[PDB]
């Protein structure tokens, strides 16, 4: 639906939608920008991620409310409406995964872009896994794991331990282990090793980079406090 708008205008409108907290619009604008076929800059990748994370975040929050009501009940209405929200969530995840697969990931050669997109791929398969129950749930989980794992392998080879993308990837992979793969020990070990190796690299950073890295380290510590 965005094929007739200029790439630069779509990006400008994505930023306006963010200021207006119109995240569905923001996602549609960034989808249109991706479909222009050019690679995305660092700032543009962040706009894409912020837009879809907020859209799917609202859907996940709603799904959890409805799933909780449904479990306390077990007419068809609560199940039907949970299924409606669930289907809408799956459609948004499929859209994001389709953008990554056509063709963001295959054109991403630099570590910062490739790790960013593979983290996204793990995240949106993780969101699919949160609602999955049928014959494909194990494959969905392995798809998340495989994307996260490839991102981890690249990040450990190509990025310092304090790199914010590397830290956020490890944070989310640790949540995957704890919440999805039923591997709380793997989750705790990953969060601990990630925190400790970043701590030992903080001395290399500027004041601004220090703030970026320690902010995400605090989320790792918050989870370790919750889990231990």
């Amino acid at each position: 639906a965005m094929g007739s708008m200029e790439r630069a205008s779509l990006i400008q409108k994505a930023k306006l939608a963010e200021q207006a907290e119109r995240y569905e619009d923001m996602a549609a604008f960034m989808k249109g920008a991706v479909e222009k076929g050019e690679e995305l800059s660092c700032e543009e990748r962040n706009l894409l991620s912020v837009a879809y994370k907020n859209v799917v975040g609202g859907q996940r929050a709603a799904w959890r409310v409805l799933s909780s009501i449904e479990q306390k009940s077990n007419g068809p209405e609560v199940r039907e409406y949970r299924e409606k929200v669930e289907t809408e969530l799956q459609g948004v995840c499929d859209t994001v995964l389709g953008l990554l697969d056509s063709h963001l990931i295959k054109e991403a050669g630099d570590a910062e872009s490739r790790v960013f997109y593979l983290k996204m791929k793990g995240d949106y398969y993780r969101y699919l896994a949160e609602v999955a129950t049928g014959d494909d749930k194990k494959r969905i989980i392995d798809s998340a794991r495989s994307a996260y794992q490839e991102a981890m392998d690249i990040s450990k080879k190509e990025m310092p331990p304090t790199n914010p993308i590397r830290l956020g990837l490890a944070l989310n992979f640790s949540v995957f282990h704890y919440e999805i793969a039923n591997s709380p020990e793997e989750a705790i070990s990953l969060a601990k090793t990630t925190f400790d190796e970043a701590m030992a690299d903080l001395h290399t950073l500027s004041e601004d980079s220090y703030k970026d890295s320690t902010l995400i380290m605090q989320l790792l510590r918050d989870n370790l406090t919750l889990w231990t």
Partner: peptide
């Protein structure tokens, strides 16, 4: 209940 990455 745990925190994934957020702004």
């Amino acid at each position: 209940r745990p925190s994934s990455w957020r702004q």
